[PDB]
Design an enzyme around this catalytic site. Sequence first.
Site, PDB file in Angstrom:
ATOM      1  N   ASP A  83       0.792  -1.226   0.000  1.00 38.07           N
ATOM      2  CA  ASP A  83       0.000   0.000   0.000  1.00 38.07           C
ATOM      3  C   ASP A  83       0.836   1.293   0.000  1.00 38.07           C
ATOM      4  O   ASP A  83       1.281   1.756   1.059  1.00 38.07           O
ATOM      5  CB  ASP A  83      -0.930  -0.015   1.223  1.00 38.07           C
ATOM      6  CG  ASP A  83      -1.774   1.219   1.327  1.00 38.07           C
ATOM      7  OD1 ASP A  83      -2.030   1.880   0.300  1.00 38.07           O
ATOM      8  OD2 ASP A  83      -2.213   1.525   2.446  1.00 38.07           O
ATOM      9  N   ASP A 124      -1.447   5.798  -5.281  1.00 40.91           N
ATOM     10  CA  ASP A 124      -1.903   4.885  -4.246  1.00 40.91           C
ATOM     11  C   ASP A 124      -2.247   3.483  -4.726  1.00 40.91           C
ATOM     12  O   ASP A 124      -3.329   3.259  -5.267  1.00 40.91           O
ATOM     13  CB  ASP A 124      -3.128   5.457  -3.558  1.00 40.91           C
ATOM     14  CG  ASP A 124      -3.513   4.671  -2.348  1.00 40.91           C
ATOM     15  OD1 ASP A 124      -3.067   3.518  -2.191  1.00 40.91           O
ATOM     16  OD2 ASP A 124      -4.255   5.222  -1.536  1.00 40.91           O
TER      17      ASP A 124
HETATM   18  C1  LIG Z   1      -9.369   1.893  -0.670  1.00 47.90           C
HETATM   19  C2  LIG Z   1      -8.503   2.175   0.567  1.00 47.90           C
HETATM   20  O1  LIG Z   1      -8.932   2.850   1.502  1.00 47.90           O
HETATM   21  N1  LIG Z   1      -7.269   1.677   0.534  1.00 47.90           N
HETATM   22  C3  LIG Z   1      -6.341   1.910   1.660  1.00 47.90           C
HETATM   23  C4  LIG Z   1      -5.644   0.609   2.089  1.00 47.90           C
HETATM   24  C5  LIG Z   1      -6.652  -0.540   2.196  1.00 47.90           C
HETATM   25  C6  LIG Z   1      -7.633  -0.492   3.169  1.00 47.90           C
HETATM   26  C7  LIG Z   1      -8.566  -1.513   3.288  1.00 47.90           C
HETATM   27  C8  LIG Z   1      -8.507  -2.578   2.416  1.00 47.90           C
HETATM   28  F1  LIG Z   1      -9.412  -3.566   2.538  1.00 47.90           F
HETATM   29  C9  LIG Z   1      -7.535  -2.625   1.420  1.00 47.90           C
HETATM   30  C10 LIG Z   1      -6.599  -1.603   1.311  1.00 47.90           C
HETATM   31  C11 LIG Z   1      -5.314   2.972   1.284  1.00 47.90           C
HETATM   32  O2  LIG Z   1      -4.334   3.061   2.321  1.00 47.90           O
HETATM   33  C12 LIG Z   1      -5.960   4.349   1.060  1.00 47.90           C
HETATM   34  N2  LIG Z   1      -4.867   5.327   0.904  1.00 47.90           N
HETATM   35  C13 LIG Z   1      -5.230   6.735   1.148  1.00 47.90           C
HETATM   36  C14 LIG Z   1      -6.178   7.239   0.047  1.00 47.90           C
HETATM   37  C15 LIG Z   1      -6.919   8.498   0.539  1.00 47.90           C
HETATM   38  C16 LIG Z   1      -6.027   9.753   0.651  1.00 47.90           C
HETATM   39  C17 LIG Z   1      -6.762  10.361  -0.549  1.00 47.90           C
HETATM   40  C18 LIG Z   1      -7.723   9.165  -0.594  1.00 47.90           C
HETATM   41  O3  LIG Z   1      -7.689   8.245   1.713  1.00 47.90           O
HETATM   42  C19 LIG Z   1      -6.979   7.708   2.760  1.00 47.90           C
HETATM   43  N3  LIG Z   1      -7.462   7.900   4.007  1.00 47.90           N
HETATM   44  C20 LIG Z   1      -6.854   7.403   5.080  1.00 47.90           C
HETATM   45  C21 LIG Z   1      -5.677   6.665   4.945  1.00 47.90           C
HETATM   46  C22 LIG Z   1      -4.991   6.106   6.189  1.00 47.90           C
HETATM   47  C23 LIG Z   1      -4.091   7.113   6.893  1.00 47.90           C
HETATM   48  C24 LIG Z   1      -3.707   6.524   8.259  1.00 47.90           C
HETATM   49  C25 LIG Z   1      -2.795   7.373   6.099  1.00 47.90           C
HETATM   50  C26 LIG Z   1      -4.869   8.414   7.095  1.00 47.90           C
HETATM   51  C27 LIG Z   1      -5.141   6.439   3.669  1.00 47.90           C
HETATM   52  C28 LIG Z   1      -5.805   6.959   2.564  1.00 47.90           C
END
Ligand SMILES: CC(=O)N[C@@H](Cc1ccc(F)cc1)[C@H](O)CN[C@H]1CC2(CCC2)Oc2ncc(CC(C)(C)C)cc21
Length: 365
Positions: free
Chosen positions: A34, A219
């Site tokens: 990620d 991302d």
């Molecule tokens: C679709 C999704 O949310 N994928 C995540 C990872 C993930 C989570 C659950 C899953 F089942 C698979 C992958 C990614 O990490 C998203 N990346 C950005 C993507 C964005 C930033 C702009 C859109 O939103 C996010 N919000 C919060 C985070 C976590 C933080 C602690 C850094 C605030 C990250 C993000």
Amino acid sequence: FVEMVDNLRGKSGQGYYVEMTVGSPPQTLNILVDTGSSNFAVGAAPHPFLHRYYQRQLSSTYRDLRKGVYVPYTQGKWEGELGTDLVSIPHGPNVTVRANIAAITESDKFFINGSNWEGILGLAYAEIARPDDSLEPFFDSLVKQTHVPNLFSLQLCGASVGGSMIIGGIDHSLYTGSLWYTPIRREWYYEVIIVRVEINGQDLKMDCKEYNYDKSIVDSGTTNLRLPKKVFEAAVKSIKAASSTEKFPDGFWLGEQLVCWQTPWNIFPVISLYLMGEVTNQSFRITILPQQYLRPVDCYKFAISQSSTGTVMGAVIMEGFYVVFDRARKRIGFAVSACHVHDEFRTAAVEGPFVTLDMEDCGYN
Ligand SMILES: CC(=O)N[C@@H](Cc1ccc(F)cc1)[C@H](O)CN[C@H]1CC2(CCC2)Oc2ncc(CC(C)(C)C)cc21
């Protein structure tokens, strides 16, 4: 770097994972890769969806940090206990490092039922780590403790998916033509600046500020090309127009409905993002085919969708390209992927230089 070629697996819509080991003796886990976050976190309890989980009691080298950690994503949240332990990537470089690990002990709509991954590897910068930026991210720990160069690259190949994470270098066999680089605007997410957009070759005459409000990022933990509102309507407007010769439902552009053939590819336009280049007033462009923003689900899903927190170049974008996260030089490189699903007629593309002025004014301040 052929040791590391094809070390990524997954399923469509469920992310890309790499095999990792934690603790002594080594416990093997599948870990989602990620570039959109900076926590290293693994399941540590027997959640029914999990194939396996991190069992701290079994590890000589485990150390408690006696701090809690909470992390919500776009959807999905987990909560955990921080610790450090020894970590390896079997199909990666030949090292072992002490890293921060969040042992996930509670989660909510995080793990995917039917998936084969048990944790998440945040590859972005400290600045966005939780609880705060003193929690050194995995890759920072990797570079500080070994001689692995401060660089990794991703060829996401796109119901099973495959790909490669080359840690510490580049494999020129994974791309064709030349790499073109855009500056990392700030080291928190992998932030870049988009400076122009074109469907089939037509500009959108929008103030380039509309592309990077309030950020644009690369991302790998996001599936879709995710544009802001204005930008999204405009691009379907343009694609619906270029493709109008076959009537398509409204559900399909919302990403609800499907189209099924037994596939008129050249019915569909190329999409183009111009990125800020390395030199004052110079940019380059990356161009995706229909074979990229149409996700096979002989049927297809429209994979461009509206966004809210800025542009997110997710796997829809990254599956056309070899992406180089050149952390040492504050830049990200794009090149045509040697694995991208193409065409006898077309290819995904990256080209330059182009002249584009006022590239600064393009990102929100
Ligand atoms: C679709 C999704 O949310 N994928 C995540 C990872 C993930 C989570 C659950 C899953 F089942 C698979 C992958 C990614 O990490 C998203 N990346 C950005 C993507 C964005 C930033 C702009 C859109 O939103 C996010 N919000 C919060 C985070 C976590 C933080 C602690 C850094 C605030 C990250 C993000």
